[PDB]
Amino acid sequence: LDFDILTNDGTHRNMKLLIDLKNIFSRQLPKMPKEYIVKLVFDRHHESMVILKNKQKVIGGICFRQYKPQRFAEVAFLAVTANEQVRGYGTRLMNKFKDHMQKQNIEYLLTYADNFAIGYFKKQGFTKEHRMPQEKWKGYIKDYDGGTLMECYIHPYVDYGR
Numbered sequence: 334l335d336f337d338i339l340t341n342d343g344t345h346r347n348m349k350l351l352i353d354l355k356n357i358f359s360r361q362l363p364k365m366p367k368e369y370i371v372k373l374v375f376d377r378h379h380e381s382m383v384i385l386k387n388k389q390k391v392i393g394g395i396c397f398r399q400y401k402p403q404r405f406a407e408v409a410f411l412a413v414t415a416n417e418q419v420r421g422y423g424t425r426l427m428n429k430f431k432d433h434m435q436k437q438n439i440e441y442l443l444t445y446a447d448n449f450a451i452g453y454f455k456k457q458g459f460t461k462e463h464r465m466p467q468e469k470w471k472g473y474i475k476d477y478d479g480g481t482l483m484e485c486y487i488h489p490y491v492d493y494g495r
């Protein structure tokens with residue numbers, strides 16, 4: 334079981350994996366326009382960390398976008414395939430992601446969660462109250478009046494994915 338950052342480098346291997354991830358996202362986030370998922374997963378600003386089983390099968394992942402100078406990242410999509418849920422993978426994935434963000438010098442994660450997903454994020458340390466001022470991400474991350482913007486601080490010397 335590996336947690337690798339997938340790069341859209343135009344190779345058959347990585348491309349297949351990103352498509353596989355994309356299909357998991359659309360399956361688990363049914364109300365999300367599939368063409369939109371495709372757009373973000375394959376654009377040049379987004380990266381995806383996948384849960385790789387047997388070094389070939391994608392069973393879940395997180396698609397995110399780093400705003401490097403600002404030191405924050407938005408979690409665009411997150412999911413574990415249905416037949417692999419409730420096995421601790423979702424949590425292991427987030428811990429691996431936080432460890433990576435810490436190494437990438439990212440200070441905060443932001444994500445718009447679906448009412449049903451809010452609980453998962455709260456479990457991972459995300460909160461509805463923000464320690465980061467609105468002015469800071471405004472202009473980089475879209476401000477939707479109809480979703481719940483959640484935030485998670487990534488401490489520079491806390492041991493994640495331990």
Ligand SMILES: CC(=O)SCCNC(=O)CCNC(=O)[C@H](O)C(C)(C)COP(=O)(O)OP(=O)(O)OC[C@H]1O[C@@H](n2cnc3c(N)ncnc32)[C@H](O)[C@@H]1OP(=O)(O)O
Pocket residue numbers: 361362408409410411412413414417418419420421422423424425444445446447449450452453456
């Ligand atoms: C921006 C984002 O995309 S928002 C949408 C997030 N994605 C989804 O909702 C997609 C559908 N869901 C999924 O793909 C999965 O259920 C995930 C990623 C939410 C969680 O993955 P799993 O492999 O099942 O996670 P894992 O088993 O490690 O979770 C363990 C803990 O998370 C909690 N948890 C997981 N899913 C949920 C949920 N939907 N609601 C509430 N709590 C949840 C478990 O209750 C558990 O609590 P515990 O450790 O005290 O027992």
